[model samples]
Target: ANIVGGIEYSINNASLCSVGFSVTRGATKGFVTAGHCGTVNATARIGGAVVGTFAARVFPGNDRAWVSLTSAQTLLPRVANGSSFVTVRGSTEAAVGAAVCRSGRTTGYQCGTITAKNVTANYAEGAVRGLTQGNACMGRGDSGGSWITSAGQAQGVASGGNVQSNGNNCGIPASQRSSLFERLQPILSQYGLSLVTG
Candidate 1:
């Protein structure tokens, strides 16, 4: 099963950062893009509605945030690429060379194969390593989007990829994805965030 395409929404009035995607809750519920999109503790909106507040966030060294949604929204255990939606059964990182896909407001939906593993990206904030690298493509406003494998397994969140002057792009690796999940899963449980699984 191809789990390449999915829906991703903008975060924080579409300010601060791009590449962030909305999870399966309220447009503003669940989680936004990343921890360091803009100033911490910012407000978010979806379809022009104030959904929720940016509860817990970690940036620079860590790129993650848990947006606690209001009771108005619902979180589902599913991921989709507009044309296709799949059950998110469990959280298992994919392996190298596995076919994977990504969905974002910018790049839309693109498919590719995992190229490298345990790679590190040197962002100005610091160096984030142990990421999954792939041929999947995306752009500036694609952060915090979802990366899934052919088996409908979750992989990495959209971060900046290899950017060339001519507008070329690539994806980070899965090693870092596992690291991010390892650090954030507890937080998700602590906040009562239900992970999407099939």
Candidate 2:
């Protein structure tokens, strides 16, 4: 599948950071993604222009971070899944076994059901607790991609998972996302970040 929205972004070959997800709060000019993809003080670009700075980074123990951008750049939180634009409706926590969809630069769009709730994925970085697991298909470059339910509710940011020879991709669950959001919201507010929506 082609890259979603044709928006130009780079994925680190070593860490694989190809996507990003927005938190639904006002004036919060930041997005969440895997912390392993890049290091703190590292820079990121969108559409070939410098857009944001890596801030509030965490790795090993937790593979998540937030990137804050200046007011001059255009950073869009919405990701297109070919047919329609997925708006971040409300970030109210999604229940276990809820239906969800994902949009990534590599996969374009795929939907699946939550397989586990409040499950932990132990990665080489360390262990992230309270992550939701799903049977959603994902691949390299899909990291940090957007996951949402049919109601257009924000799920969780996509993280890498095991892939079989037959081609299966699992995803992190939205419930865990809710938990992470609950923790990160205060941090974003502390930094004066804003989440702009249409």
Candidate 3:
């Protein structure tokens, strides 16, 4: 339950979701995740232990947010890639057809190619603009997870997918699965935050 990216994190009374990446705004340190994960000022915890607070969030337009970690919490520039950890080097946006992978608490690690950029998704929460579409298969609890590249480049944060509601089971077939992620470049620019790269 450590506060590393791609790990399970809870927001107040909300269900568990994955963390995106470590970030910094001036002296403030925290991590970024999907905006739909929590609202502003919501307490962020790891296994019930308070670690941070939701400082900013933007949903329906862009699924991005940053948590302001407490003094006791430290930001780590690494993401969980299956059993191992991948060091985050930078936040360079990958091109279409580029290889990408995502890590989540439910769907450990999954790789796919970027199908399109600047894509829009109409979810039940509303429509989100400027997303990167991929062939990765993601599930319910995979929201707010890290979408990283093989070369250790930070891509984006998992927003949602076309998986059916079968609980937390990510048993959807590959053909029926498609993922939408908020690009990291715009998110960082919007919040005036910098990525914590190794």
Candidate 4:
């Protein structure tokens, strides 16, 4: 069966994160996610099936990483939409104030507007720069999730957030809700990975 992004995958069950976009490194197929989710060489499984291995990772410095899939596993362009699915047509960056949607295993799917760019998220580990902020609500385990525009353009991947979560969705006081994403260009350019378009 073909695997899509936004699905839940665990790294040795010790770490779990949402899958990002489908991508390819020359001929190898795989997907992107938060580097903090797992370390390189860790085995990654979607459900009980061992799908791939953490080929490379960039942590607190960038929050981007990618898994190299086995030949048996196929990476698809579409990602889970909670209700259905969405496609990844390109990796074009979206501007601030542009509308985008995030898909994750925890929250499923949620839409929000890009609030700011060149944002710096100071995590306990360290500060992550070149990030984008949005009004979306995301929680733990949603890390490495996919962020895409309504037009099927890949924007970024869910990095981390500091918003009150009600466990189901973004909680009240929407004005205070903000989530951060690790931009896509650096992830691809630095990794030599290419987005797989539908």
RMSD of each: 5.8, 5.5, 1.6, 1.5
Candidate order (lDDT)? 4, 3, 2, 1
Evaluate residue 140 in candidate 2 and report its C-alpha lDDT on the 0 to 100 scale.
63
lDDT of 2 by residue, 1-198 (tens): 122221335533233355555542356455666666677666767656565667766665555676665666555546677867876565555666777777776667777777666566667767765566776676666666666776766666666666445333434443332212112233345445444343
- Give the candidates in order of TM-score, highest first: 4, 3, 2, 1
Which is the winner by lDDT between candidate 1 and candidate 2? Answer: 2
Cα lDDT over the full model 4 = 0.86
**Model-by-model lDDT, in order?**
0.55, 0.57, 0.86, 0.86
Clash number for model 4?
A: 0
36-140: candidate 3 lDDT, tens digit per residue = 999999988887788889999999888898888887777888989877898899988889999899988887888888998888889888999989888877888
Q: Which stretches of candidate 4 lie over 4 Å from their true place?
A: 165-169
Q: What is the lDDT of residue 191 in candidate 3?
A: 88
Which runs of model 1 end up more than 4 angstroms from their true locations? 1-11, 14-29, 165-193
Best by TM-score: 4
TM-score for predicted model 3 compared with the true structure: 0.94
TM-score of each model, paired residue for residue: 0.73, 0.74, 0.94, 0.95
Q: How accurate is candidate 2 locally (lDDT)?
A: 0.57
